[PDB]
From Swiss-Prot:
Positions annotated to bind [2Fe-2S] cluster: C41, C46, C49, C79
Domain 2Fe-2S ferredoxin-type: 3-95
UniProt lineage: Bacteria, Bacillati, Cyanobacteriota, Cyanophyceae, Nostocales
UniProt name for this protein: Ferredoxin-1
Assembly information from the UniProt record: Forms a complex with heterodimeric ferredoxin-thioredoxin reductase (FTR) and thioredoxin.
Cofactor details (free text): Binds 1 [2Fe-2S] cluster.
Swiss-Prot/TrEMBL GO biological process terms: electron transport chain
Family affiliation: Belongs to the 2Fe2S plant-type ferredoxin family.
Length: 98
């Protein structure tokens, strides 16, 4: 399967739509498709690539930085997140954790 992923940058008021395979991390797909997103560790151990889900679901089982509450609040580490449905997500949300 291939899911549609809508990336929203509220601060800049931009929107990008990309198609991501069910076995590819969002970050990777976005880059390949021409959209650079913030990142640092690239390994699910930091908050640089944080995004916030608006709708849809993902699988970010490889992540380790986010606690359960953050997860419940909809936060996602885009560098290790696989879409499990069509998703709409807000990017550049790191600030939200401080
Ligand atoms: S870039 Fe560090 S968790 Fe994604």
């Amino acid at each position: 399967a291939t899911f549609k992923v809508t990336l929203i940058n509220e601060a800049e008021g931009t929107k990008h739509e990309i198609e991501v395979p069910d076995d590819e991390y969002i970050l990777d797909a976005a880059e390949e498709q021409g959209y650079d997103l913030p990142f640092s560790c690239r390994a699910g151990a930091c908050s640089t690539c944080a995004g916030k889900l608006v709708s849809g679901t993902v699988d970010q089982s490889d992540q380790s930085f986010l606690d359960d509450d953050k997860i419940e609040a909809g936060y996602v580490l885009t560098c290790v997140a696989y879409p499990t449905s069509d998703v709409v997500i807000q990017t550049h949300k790191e600030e939200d954790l401080y």
